[PDB]
Amino acid sequence: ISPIETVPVKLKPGMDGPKVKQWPLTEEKIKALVEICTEMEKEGKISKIGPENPYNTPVFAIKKKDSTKWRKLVDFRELNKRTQDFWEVQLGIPHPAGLKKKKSVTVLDVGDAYFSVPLDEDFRKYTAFTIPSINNETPGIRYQYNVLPQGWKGSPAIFQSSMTKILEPFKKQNPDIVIYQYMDDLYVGSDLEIGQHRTKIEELRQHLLRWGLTTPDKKHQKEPPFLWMGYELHPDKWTVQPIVLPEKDSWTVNDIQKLVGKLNWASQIYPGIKVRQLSKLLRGTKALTEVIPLTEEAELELAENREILKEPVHGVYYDPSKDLIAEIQKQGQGQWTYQIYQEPFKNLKTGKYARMRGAHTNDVKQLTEAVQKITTESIVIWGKTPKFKLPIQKETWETWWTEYWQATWIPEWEFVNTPPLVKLWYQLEKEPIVGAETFYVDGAANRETKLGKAGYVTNKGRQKVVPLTNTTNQKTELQAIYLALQDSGLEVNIVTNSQYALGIIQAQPDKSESELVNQIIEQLIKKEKVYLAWVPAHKGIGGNEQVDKLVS
Amino acid sequence: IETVPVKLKPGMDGPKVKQWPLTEEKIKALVEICTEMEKEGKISKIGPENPYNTPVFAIKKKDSTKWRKLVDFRELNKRTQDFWEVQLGIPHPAGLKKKKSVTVLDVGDAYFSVPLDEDFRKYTAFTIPSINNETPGIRYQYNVLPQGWKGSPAIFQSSMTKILEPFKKQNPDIVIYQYMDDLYVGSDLEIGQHRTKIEELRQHLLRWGLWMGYELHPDKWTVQPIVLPEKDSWTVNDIQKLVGKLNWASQIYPGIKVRQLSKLLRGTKALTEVIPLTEEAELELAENREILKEPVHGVYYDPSKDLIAEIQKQGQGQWTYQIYQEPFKNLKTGKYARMRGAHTNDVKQLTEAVQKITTESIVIWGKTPKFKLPIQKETWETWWTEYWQATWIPEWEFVNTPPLVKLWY
DNA sequence: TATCCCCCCTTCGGTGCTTTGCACCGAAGGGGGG
Ligand SMILES: O=C(Nc1nccs1)[C@@H]1C[C@H]1c1ccccc1
């Protein structure tokens, strides 16, 4: 064994170690001495300190985890917040699509490496644990950890630091050997011949044994496929582990959440996954034991997802000698899919974007949100922003970014004709229309009464006022614009006294959470030319003062 | 010199900021630069026990090929206990605005000779991420004064004064003011002699302790008052929009009166009808136009407040901005126009406008402003690094409400 | 009644201000994989 250095660990200042007794347990689930404890004491992972360590921690045996293997899962829920904080240095999880074409691949596993990495001397006392012996009728003996506990707050960071320190000399001495080290896995690949690669693997094993870490051949995976973090590595292919979707005839909300989660997990390779109808059932919902009915849309969506998943699909590994191309498609209701690839019909990765940013948004903005996401994911996974192949027309994009009040950009894209193509349905007018009808719209509502009036006046003299109930001033403004749009012809000039409504319709939305806005968009797309203008309120400007008195 | 102990303000802990993802070339440049720095001993690798982290970005300054490291210090500067007030950052030359030429020099490399206080070393930690998360982030720690920290010039003040004393001795025709890592050198003399003299100043600094160059002209800077349209025949829509603009201006200038202008709009006419102005209307319009032409009265800088900068997109590559401490007491209203080669990149235009505005604000008042960017946070954080060149970073907030304003166009 | 990571999704009081509703957002929990 080698003397791998320990890391100094302390509690948070001004607060001391916990003392938590153990909940009542069962004789079947426990022992007079938890038989693994004595063996670990002999092995050196645990020592005995009885009189002068008046600290404790909850200890139990797990039956659900690892197929009732009875793992010694000691719970440190209190000491975790009682101890100092740590900065975990790894953020995400490696993706095979970021891997290269390596001729020889071997996966090494380090079993119980946490219990092999030593713990700091001072902090050993704070991890004291005791267990009752028989039916909680005997006290038992109090022990204390000598190595890294399983599930302690600093354990992952400390183990990663120790393991990268161990692996540093070997990586330095061999630059051609690639070694992915995530948590408790060790993917090792190379461009060497198979025999020489296995020889290097044996040198790696002997090096780790010199450092006290062993890689048992029980978990040492020799030949492909190599199960890696739930993926199936092949010489020229990768695939997620085969998925077993719930085929239950009845569907609870818990089962629906399981379905959508497994569908999201399968979405990174299977194209065309949609979960919007299965999440509209999740919003609001009900008690988890309530048998949730399935809408026709939801069941059609599930059938389509099943027919997608009934065939196998696979990705390909990265090749730095080529370029990355991503094509975006539109799936309606605010759903988008992309197929990042390098050569046609062999896609490195796949995914979906279905978020709704804002109560009022349209196709162009959501496509910009999709490209801006794909960008940051591609940066994370490859370090290069891909070339986009968008459905938006170049003229439409130019118009949008030149006339929009924000700063928007898309890195580099070529227009691809794949319907439904993103296009702007309606445009407003910059100059008043010659020979159009002018409407002065105003709506006044008292919040203390939850009533109000909405209507308009016109230069040609026609007037209208409708009473309102259970609506706010904003609503009244939107309804006033709605009446002005409805009662007018294909060309109309509307004067409004509401910056809120003027900004909402000016943002040029296509879909909204408000039926008022949806109806307004339908009227506007039906119309041919529409102009909007804003005047101050209570300014005595023309018939606006009169209509204000009418709707007050 | 000796290390001056640095402590935080009472009751609040050090920085904890995540690291934004970087591209392949930026990561490679960062790795090479940090390897060289560690070999020189300027940084030391650190373990997991440090719970502090600040983001680091890689940039490439203009007219160069070498990459340059840039570490975001915003949080640490905001947390540090008064190395801008208790230390020599207070005095700002009121005559810096009135100079024909203002040059910007780079003096950040001089800070790498003074070690930092050991009790404060733990706070200046940063992480270098890896592609695809392939390896844990290579953490580090500064062994010397860090570039971009507000207390770094505070520490180096005692040496910078000594270095610059002879230059002010033989040549007291230049006003000198440094903000963080940069030195603003301004001379009121002819531009031809100005460039040759900086070479001597650069030579003097070179031998005692780089070949780039910047140029500003603070004299040719004016506040932009708002102006009403000047038309002979006025339409109903044009009169309504003019009255709206005057109502906007009324919150700023109390002298504006729109009683007669509102009296002119008395019934319902079509938007395209022409309304001829009356005598009283013309008189009121002339008075209001003179009031608007007159520079704003009552605006005074207050050091107890903070500067807030608005930015509006006016279209066709033109932007406007306003620096103020109170929303109706604007200190400087300006305008930016798209430069050649950047007419098709809103992120690039806004990023260069931010640098121009902050440089002007530093030169004028000696306090960088709090930006209010008209952009999405996600796309800004994604693409603002590819175009940034300054070695300092302001604090910006985002806005998603439309401005709707033609008041500044 | 195990820890910590990425991810998806909906629900929430909390501030801007665009007012006292409304738009917007970050902090949690409910799942998926480690
Ligand atoms: O060890 C591991 N092996 C595996 N490879 C493939 C599938 S599971 C998992 C990464 C480990 C982990 C699990 C729970 C909590 C913390 C950490």
Side-chain angles (χ1 to χ4, degrees), chain A residues 1-20 22-38 40-48 50-51 53-62 67-134 136 139-149 151-171 173-217 219-243 245-279 281-284 287-291 293-299 301 303-355 357-449 451-468 472-537 540-543 546-547 550-552, chain B residues 1 3-17 19-61 64-81 83 85-86 88-89 91-105 107-164 166-168 170-229 231 233-256 258 260-278 281-296 298-339 341-409:
Chain A
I1 199 184
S2 277
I4 180 64
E5 293 179 353
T6 71
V7 158
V9 176
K10 72 169 184 292
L11 292 183
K12 240 184 300 179
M15 81 205 298
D16 63 308
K19 320 186 183 196
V20 185
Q22 50 269 356
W23 45 73
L25 294 161
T26 317
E27 174 59 84
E28 200 282 321
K29 201 213 312 172
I30 72 154
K31 201 85 161 189
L33 283 78
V34 179
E35 280 305 320
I36 50 179
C37 82
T38 302
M40 289 196 299
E41 284 217 9
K42 177 182 157 49
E43 214 173 343
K45 326 293 195 55
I46 289 173
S47 287
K48 267 200 277 205
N53 276 345
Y55 289 155
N56 207 18
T57 194
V59 57
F60 86 107
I62 190 68
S67 72
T68 190
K69 262 172 47 182
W70 309 114
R71 324 166 51 184
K72 191 188 192 164
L73 286 180
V74 191
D75 295 331
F76 299 117
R77 269 85 66 88
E78 191 56 350
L79 183 140
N80 272 359
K81 82 170 180 184
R82 185 83 39 82
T83 192
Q84 87 169 5
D85 216 326
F86 297 76
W87 187 260
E88 185 67 22
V89 308
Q90 62 98 4
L91 294 174
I93 307 170
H95 208 275
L99 263 63
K100 272 75 56 175
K101 320 320 204 181
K102 303 298 181 185
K103 271 193 42 55
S104 300
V105 167
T106 303
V107 172
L108 278 296
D109 208 297
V110 296
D112 208 9
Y114 286 6
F115 276 12
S116 78
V117 173
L119 186 63
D120 186 74
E121 287 83 15
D122 174 336
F123 204 69
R124 274 160 193 173
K125 51 189 279 292
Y126 298 108
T127 52
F129 56 96
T130 189
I131 188 76
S133 298
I134 47 166
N136 282 44
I141 317 295
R142 206 179 46 67
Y143 292 165
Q144 53 84 0
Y145 263 111
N146 189 28
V147 294
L148 268 184
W152 175 59
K153 198 171 83 175
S155 304
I158 289 176
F159 169 64
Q160 293 179 356
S161 298
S162 299
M163 179 94 188
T164 191
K165 274 192 222 282
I166 291 154
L167 288 163
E168 171 190 35
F170 194 12
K171 288 171 185 169
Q173 282 161 23
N174 277 318
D176 303 340
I177 308 314
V178 176
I179 309 180
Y180 273 62
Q181 173 249 319
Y182 177 63
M183 279 294 189
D184 286 24
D185 312 321
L186 210 65
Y187 155 75
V188 176
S190 165
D191 274 24
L192 294 174
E193 295 196 9
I194 177 62
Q196 315 176 19
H197 160 71
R198 205 79 73 206
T199 295
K200 266 63 160 184
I201 301 299
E202 276 296 339
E203 321 315 320
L204 198 157
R205 284 189 74 192
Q206 87 184 20
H207 186 296
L208 272 165
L209 194 54
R210 285 211 287 91
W211 275 88
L213 264 292
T214 180
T215 51
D217 218 319
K219 264 182 168 204
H220 165 92
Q221 305 163 357
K222 182 62 65 68
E223 283 291 299
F226 310 99
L227 193 150
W228 186 34
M229 301 166 298
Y231 300 170
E232 214 172 40
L233 314 180
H234 303 56
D236 294 288
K237 174 183 201 293
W238 72 266
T239 311
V240 302
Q241 286 308 139
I243 190 167
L245 280 187
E247 270 283 338
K248 305 143 185 160
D249 203 9
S250 185
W251 279 101
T252 56
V253 296
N254 218 11
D255 292 332
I256 286 179
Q257 307 212 51
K258 274 182 231 293
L259 196 70
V260 304
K262 273 187 200 164
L263 271 174
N264 285 280
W265 178 246
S267 84
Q268 293 114 340
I269 193 62
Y270 289 83
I273 303 299
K274 324 192 211 313
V275 311
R276 279 220 84 83
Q277 276 65 234
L278 284 166
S279 298
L281 301 158
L282 305 174
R283 72 185 62 183
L288 269 56
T289 62
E290 184 267 336
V291 180
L294 278 188
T295 306
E296 188 274 330
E297 298 157 354
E299 65 183 1
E301 195 184 40
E304 291 172 24
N305 291 338
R306 280 183 171 85
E307 74 184 4
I308 291 158
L309 276 154
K310 80 189 173 177
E311 302 194 8
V313 298
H314 73 92
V316 181
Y317 295 120
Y318 181 43
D319 183 357
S321 303
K322 314 295 298 149
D323 301 64
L324 302 170
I325 319 163
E327 315 198 359
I328 304 190
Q329 284 99 23
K330 177 200 209 320
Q331 303 304 80
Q333 295 97 18
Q335 302 152 34
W336 310 78
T337 68
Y338 54 91
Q339 309 96 41
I340 304 187
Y341 75 91
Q342 298 206 162
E343 293 82 3
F345 305 105
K346 321 197 291 285
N347 49 320
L348 296 195
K349 202 171 84 71
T350 300
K352 51 171 290 288
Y353 174 72
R355 214 181 181 281
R357 294 271 161 61
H360 310 325
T361 313
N362 58 9
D363 280 332
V364 176
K365 258 191 294 196
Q366 288 176 355
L367 186 143
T368 303
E369 294 157 11
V371 305
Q372 188 274 315
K373 181 255 182 187
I374 299 178
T375 299
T376 56
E377 315 291 351
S378 179
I379 300 299
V380 164
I381 308 191
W382 281 276
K384 301 192 328 188
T385 296
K387 312 182 173 310
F388 289 128
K389 282 197 187 301
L390 303 181
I392 189 168
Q393 193 73 262
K394 291 164 172 293
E395 191 255 330
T396 300
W397 170 233
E398 184 170 355
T399 305
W400 177 248
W401 79 264
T402 50
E403 269 78 356
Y404 193 33
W405 63 266
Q406 280 203 347
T408 61
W409 191 58
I410 300 192
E412 178 181 0
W413 56 277
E414 271 67 12
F415 157 76
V416 172
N417 200 332
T418 298
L421 306 164
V422 167
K423 283 179 306 293
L424 281 191
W425 284 342
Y426 77 85
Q427 303 74 250
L428 304 98
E429 271 316 294
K430 40 181 67 67
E431 303 287 326
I433 301 299
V434 176
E437 199 171 1
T438 303
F439 294 87
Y440 300 162
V441 294
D442 187 1
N446 201 351
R447 75 280 191 191
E448 301 182 358
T449 317
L451 301 170
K453 284 156 284 292
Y456 62 85
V457 293
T458 306
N459 59 348
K460 285 161 175 47
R462 60 174 294 168
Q463 309 212 12
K464 183 168 73 175
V465 165
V466 309
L468 214 49
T472 48
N473 280 289
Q474 295 89 9
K475 259 55 184 179
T476 66
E477 304 297 328
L478 280 293
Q479 304 196 17
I481 289 174
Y482 186 47
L483 311 185
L485 268 165
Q486 218 170 340
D487 290 350
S488 49
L490 297 162
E491 294 79 31
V492 55
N493 284 352
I494 291 143
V495 181
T496 198
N497 187 339
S498 192
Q499 281 182 333
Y500 165 89
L502 189 77
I504 291 175
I505 296 89
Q506 199 181 39
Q508 193 159 352
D510 289 339
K511 44 213 171 202
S512 175
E513 302 175 0
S514 287
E515 75 292 352
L516 261 56
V517 189
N518 280 291
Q519 285 137 5
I520 286 166
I521 298 145
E522 281 325 319
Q523 303 299 317
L524 289 162
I525 181 167
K526 274 163 31 203
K527 286 321 167 197
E528 182 145 70
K529 302 250 172 172
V530 174
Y531 180 107
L532 271 295
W534 185 80
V535 288
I541 297 308
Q546 281 74 67
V547 75
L550 271 53
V551 301
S552 291
Chain B
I1 49 172
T3 67
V4 164
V6 192
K7 44 212 171 293
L8 281 293
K9 288 178 185 63
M12 65 182 180
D13 206 278
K16 295 183 181 64
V17 189
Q19 165 84 46
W20 180 268
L22 303 169
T23 57
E24 181 185 4
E25 55 190 5
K26 291 186 183 291
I27 294 170
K28 290 194 174 307
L30 269 187
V31 174
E32 266 184 348
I33 283 162
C34 279
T35 288
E36 171 275 358
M37 293 177 71
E38 180 164 19
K39 169 195 316 186
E40 289 315 271
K42 314 182 193 180
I43 48 178
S44 60
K45 296 200 72 169
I46 192 166
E49 73 291 333
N50 204 357
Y52 304 125
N53 189 359
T54 65
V56 64
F57 313 100
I59 65 160
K60 197 191 305 199
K61 211 170 280 183
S64 77
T65 61
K66 57 211 303 190
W67 296 81
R68 190 195 181 280
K69 196 164 71 88
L70 197 149
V71 187
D72 179 287
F73 275 109
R74 294 205 308 266
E75 182 65 26
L76 185 54
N77 288 335
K78 195 192 67 191
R79 292 262 165 263
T80 306
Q81 182 176 20
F83 281 48
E85 179 70 35
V86 191
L88 298 183
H92 176 83
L96 199 41
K97 328 174 193 177
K98 295 98 185 181
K99 298 293 183 182
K100 297 296 289 183
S101 312
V102 159
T103 290
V104 192
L105 284 174
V107 76
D109 44 0
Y111 294 72
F112 282 172
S113 296
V114 187
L116 192 138
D117 183 48
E118 309 317 320
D119 183 87
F120 213 79
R121 296 275 294 278
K122 50 169 174 174
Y123 296 118
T124 75
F126 65 92
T127 300
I128 294 183
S130 183
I131 282 166
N132 196 9
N133 284 139
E134 193 276 299
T135 41
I138 309 100
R139 283 184 64 88
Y140 282 107
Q141 181 187 198
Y142 268 124
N143 294 340
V144 298
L145 276 180
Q147 283 168 327
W149 178 41
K150 76 189 289 185
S152 190
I155 295 314
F156 205 63
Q157 195 75 26
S158 47
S159 307
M160 203 87 217
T161 59
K162 162 181 208 180
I163 295 153
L164 293 169
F167 184 85
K168 281 192 205 155
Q170 293 83 18
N171 296 295
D173 54 49
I174 293 169
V175 173
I176 284 180
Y177 182 89
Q178 69 164 355
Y179 197 71
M180 310 207 162
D181 294 351
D182 273 326
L183 189 73
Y184 299 109
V185 55
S187 81
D188 209 353
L189 58 87
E190 191 275 300
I191 188 178
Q193 305 280 112
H194 182 74
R195 295 179 66 250
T196 50
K197 184 169 194 142
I198 298 300
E199 177 89 37
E200 321 182 13
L201 194 171
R202 197 188 77 198
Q203 273 312 339
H204 170 218
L205 171 70
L206 183 63
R207 56 160 175 258
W208 201 100
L210 279 169
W211 310 276
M212 293 180 183
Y214 279 147
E215 201 196 80
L216 314 184
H217 292 246
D219 282 26
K220 308 186 295 181
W221 291 347
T222 53
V223 192
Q224 286 214 352
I226 46 179
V227 287
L228 310 172
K231 194 152 49 180
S233 308
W234 297 90
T235 305
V236 167
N237 172 56
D238 305 339
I239 282 292
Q240 293 180 356
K241 85 196 182 190
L242 176 137
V243 167
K245 180 150 201 201
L246 282 169
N247 176 44
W248 281 327
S250 170
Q251 295 297 109
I252 312 168
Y253 304 168
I256 291 145
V258 288
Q260 295 281 330
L261 296 151
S262 74
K263 263 177 168 176
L264 191 63
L265 303 163
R266 186 166 291 176
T268 79
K269 284 63 61 183
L271 286 178
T272 61
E273 160 161 346
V274 173
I275 299 193
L277 305 192
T278 52
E282 280 285 350
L283 171 62
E284 270 276 3
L285 201 163
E287 305 297 329
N288 300 352
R289 179 172 298 180
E290 281 276 2
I291 297 169
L292 268 70
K293 187 182 288 184
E294 196 255 342
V296 59
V299 286
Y300 64 92
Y301 184 109
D302 188 13
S304 61
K305 280 191 187 175
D306 213 318
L307 293 178
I308 301 157
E310 300 282 330
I311 301 168
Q312 296 90 19
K313 182 176 159 192
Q314 294 303 332
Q316 303 333 319
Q318 285 150 338
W319 312 71
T320 50
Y321 53 82
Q322 299 92 57
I323 297 90
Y324 63 90
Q325 295 194 330
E326 196 79 329
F328 300 105
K329 324 292 181 143
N330 301 48
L331 307 186
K332 189 179 198 290
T333 54
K335 182 176 174 66
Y336 179 82
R338 50 158 192 211
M339 271 296 256
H343 64 286
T344 182
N345 202 335
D346 293 88
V347 182
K348 178 163 187 180
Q349 296 173 0
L350 186 56
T351 317
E352 295 170 335
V354 163
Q355 301 174 154
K356 162 182 167 309
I357 296 168
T358 189
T359 314
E360 294 185 9
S361 183
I362 289 303
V363 167
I364 295 158
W365 300 291
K367 184 161 80 186
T368 196
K370 196 207 66 174
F371 275 80
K372 308 202 55 182
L373 295 205
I375 198 164
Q376 270 191 2
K377 164 186 308 180
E378 283 76 17
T379 182
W380 176 252
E381 290 297 332
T382 316
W383 285 106
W384 83 290
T385 67
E386 301 275 290
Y387 304 104
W388 194 263
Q389 308 287 255
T391 55
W392 60 107
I393 282 168
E395 54 185 359
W396 60 87
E397 185 199 356
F398 297 97
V399 297
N400 272 20
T401 314
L404 184 144
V405 286
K406 283 289 184 68
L407 182 58
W408 322 104
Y409 193 82

